[PDB]
Amino acid sequence: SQIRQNYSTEVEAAVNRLVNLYLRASYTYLSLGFYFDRDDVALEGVCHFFRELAEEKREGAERLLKMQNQRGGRALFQDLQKPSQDEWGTTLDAMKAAIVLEKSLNQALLDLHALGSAQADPHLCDFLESHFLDEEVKLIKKMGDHLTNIQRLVGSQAGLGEYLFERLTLKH
Amino acid sequence: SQIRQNYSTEVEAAVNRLVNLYLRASYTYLSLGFYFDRDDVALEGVCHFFRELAEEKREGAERLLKMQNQRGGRALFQDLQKPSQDEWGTTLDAMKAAIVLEKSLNQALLDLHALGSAQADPHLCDFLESHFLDEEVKLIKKMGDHLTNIQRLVGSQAGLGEYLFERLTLKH
Amino acid sequence: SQIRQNYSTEVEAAVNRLVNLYLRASYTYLSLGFYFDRDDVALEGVCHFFRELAEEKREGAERLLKMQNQRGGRALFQDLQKPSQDEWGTTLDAMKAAIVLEKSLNQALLDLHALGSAQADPHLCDFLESHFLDEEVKLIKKMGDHLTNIQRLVGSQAGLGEYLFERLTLKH
Amino acid sequence: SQIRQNYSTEVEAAVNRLVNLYLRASYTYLSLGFYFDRDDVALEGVCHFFRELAEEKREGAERLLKMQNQRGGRALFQDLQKPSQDEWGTTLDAMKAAIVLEKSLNQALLDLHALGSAQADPHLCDFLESHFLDEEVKLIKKMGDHLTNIQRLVGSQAGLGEYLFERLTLKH
Ligand SMILES: [Pd+2]
Ligand SMILES: [Pd+2]
Ligand SMILES: [Pd+2]
Ligand SMILES: [Pd+2]
Ligand SMILES: [Pd+2]
Ligand SMILES: [Pd+2]
Ligand SMILES: [Pd+2]
Ligand SMILES: [Pd+2]
Ligand SMILES: [Pd+2]
Ligand SMILES: [Pd+2]
Ligand SMILES: [Pd+2]
Ligand SMILES: [Pd+2]
Ligand SMILES: [Pd+2]
Ligand SMILES: [Pd+2]
Ligand SMILES: [Pd+2]
Ligand SMILES: [Pd+2]
Ligand SMILES: [Pd+2]
Ligand SMILES: [Pd+2]
Ligand SMILES: [Pd+2]
Ligand SMILES: [Pd+2]
Ligand SMILES: [Pd+2]
Ligand SMILES: [Pd+2]
Ligand SMILES: [Pd+2]
Ligand SMILES: [Pd+2]
Ligand SMILES: [Pd+2]
Ligand SMILES: [Pd+2]
Ligand SMILES: [Pd+2]
Ligand SMILES: [Pd+2]
Ligand SMILES: [Pd+2]
Ligand SMILES: [Pd+2]
Ligand SMILES: [Pd+2]
Ligand SMILES: [Pd+2]
Ligand SMILES: [Pd+2]
Ligand SMILES: [Pd+2]
């Protein structure tokens, strides 16, 4: 009703879904974090790497909402799906689930930049690049590096490898 | 399987529900915060009072989970219901919805302390008192005080009252 | 004649017009500022909010010219139209005239980014995004917020509302 | 004979036994500490983690006695049973014996809070909660976490695992 200019309804709706994907990502990381803090799991380095993660993904969603408000859009919130798992297995399984997760957020950012361009919205561009696409590429680089390291501490000594990985790379 | 001692399954389950109630409260406050930041609402003092709120309720849920982990319990997460409203009306409506909200969290804390006592769990007691019941009583006091003030800037000059309330009590 | 590379004549000309639109905006804000400093208007908070404004819009035009020089373009200056009004009415009227003004600058920035893309000029992109489109979106957000507040101090007590708005939001 | 008020003889006696259980725990940890300092055992990280332990359990017993004096009770001391073992085996065996030990102290604290409530002694409550039950829950969490880690450095490489555990988690 007042400051909205060159901010289409389809972008608005896609921004709304992206906030939902970020908060769900936040929620996943929170679950991942408390899982590795369990007394029969107990890997503190892995718990805080995920905490953290949950914060980043939560700041992602906040940065989006505020942007949405800046353009005269309207935040609409939906239910947050619970994380896809209750137990997360080993640091390896967990780090796979995170990369799957960040890859899908990256894809959603790309699907939305492709919408920005097709909607003559050069400023969204721009906001997504300067603020999201970059972090996302670095992060996925960092997780891939971790995965490569866990995978090399592979076999036949799974317990020792996780212990050392968590002691020597994750802690903190 | 290891450190769990005098931590019943019913307490575990009730702790799980309480984390869910706290995160839903967090989510509500996030919605409330971005609502008052809209360009056709624009009350910054009210937006940050809610931000804040969302943090506190999120720290509440974290303090519970960590406790749950300390006792050898197991965090179980469920879907988070979206906030009960998409638009929150005036500062008055919003501050009513918050008190309704904090009252129901307080009741859930009480229902759980009544379970702690009936489950011979003197330590939960204790954790809930030293950490939750108190904040909750102060907070509800602070909101009631606000409500009494908004209600006195009542009629016939609604716009002026909200402006002054937000300038003189809420900002910041 | 020397460093110019991938800088079309149509972009040059549009950059020239945009500098003119920015300086005219500067001039408008200068008039707005001295108006509210008149002894029969006398609202100091509103005078310096506009001063300020005039500076920003003047830095906008300078940033454009220097860019134009960097690309080997040639600054061409035209007459500056006097502001559209000699008296600016109330803070409300004035804040409407400013938003109309900043909206039209934003549109001109967009018309020029659409030209940058259609002229295979990825660097202008880029310069406009990193430096102009963003400030413009924040600013229009800030003015819209003001307008919403003035409009809520609406009726029947116009004098009191402006006084309080200027005391409690604009000052300084 | 003077300040004693609402402090039953059965509580007095149970407090006396609890001091004895704490000092015996202190004594156990002292033995555990000097065992791992033996030249054919030689694990310094494990020796100081137990020293420490012995101090905490000794401060536990002191905090109880002083409380007992505050209420007008009378400290009665009994013989201290020697620790249940002369050699403590591996860090794993030792960390099992400690958890068994702290669990039984926790149970005794609970048996005594159940006595406090059944003796209309709201202040003991209270003293046990604010000062003992909590430390005990954290500590058992910390030991369980250790055990889970030792158990994962399990097989077939017992020597390496203890060395690394002691180097990377216990030291110091
Ligand atoms: Pd609007
Ligand atoms: Pd943790
Ligand atoms: Pd950490
Ligand atoms: Pd952690
Ligand atoms: Pd941490
Ligand atoms: Pd933006
Ligand atoms: Pd882009
Ligand atoms: Pd671009
Ligand atoms: Pd860290
Ligand atoms: Pd367990
Ligand atoms: Pd805000
Ligand atoms: Pd604030
Ligand atoms: Pd705010
Ligand atoms: Pd704020
Ligand atoms: Pd606890
Ligand atoms: Pd209690
Ligand atoms: Pd109590
Ligand atoms: Pd604040
Ligand atoms: Pd040249
Ligand atoms: Pd002035
Ligand atoms: Pd000023
Ligand atoms: Pd001024
Ligand atoms: Pd000034
Ligand atoms: Pd440039
Ligand atoms: Pd661009
Ligand atoms: Pd200023
Ligand atoms: Pd006495
Ligand atoms: Pd030693
Ligand atoms: Pd040590
Ligand atoms: Pd030592
Ligand atoms: Pd030492
Ligand atoms: Pd006492
Ligand atoms: Pd108690
Ligand atoms: Pd130490």
Curated annotation (Swiss-Prot), chains A, B, C, D:
Region (Catalytic site for iron oxidation): 52-59
PROSITE patterns, sorted: FERRITIN_1, FERRITIN_2, FERRITIN_LIKE
Pfam family of the protein (one): Ferritin
Annotated Ferritin-like diiron domain residues: 5-154
Binding annotation for Fe cation: E52, E55, E56, E59, E62
Keywords: Acetylation, Cytoplasm, Cytoplasmic vesicle, Iron, Iron storage, Lysosome, Metal-binding
Keyword Acetylation: yes
Gene Ontology biological process terms in this record: intracellular iron ion homeostasis; iron ion transport
Cell compartments where the protein resides: Cytoplasmic vesicle, Autophagosome; Cytoplasm; Autolysosome
Subunit and interaction comment: Oligomer of 24 subunits. There are two types of subunits: L (light) chain and H (heavy) chain. The major chain can be light or heavy, depending on the species and tissue type. The functional molecule forms a roughly spherical shell with a diameter of 12 nm and contains a central cavity into which the insoluble mineral iron core is deposited. Interacts with NCOA4.
Function text: Stores iron in a soluble, non-toxic, readily available form. Important for iron homeostasis. Iron is taken up in the ferrous form and deposited as ferric hydroxides after oxidation. Also plays a role in delivery of iron to cells. Mediates iron uptake in capsule cells of the developing kidney. Delivery to lysosomes by the cargo receptor NCOA4 for autophagic degradation and release or iron.
Protein name in the entry: Ferritin light chain
Organism expressing this protein natively: Equus caballus (Horse)
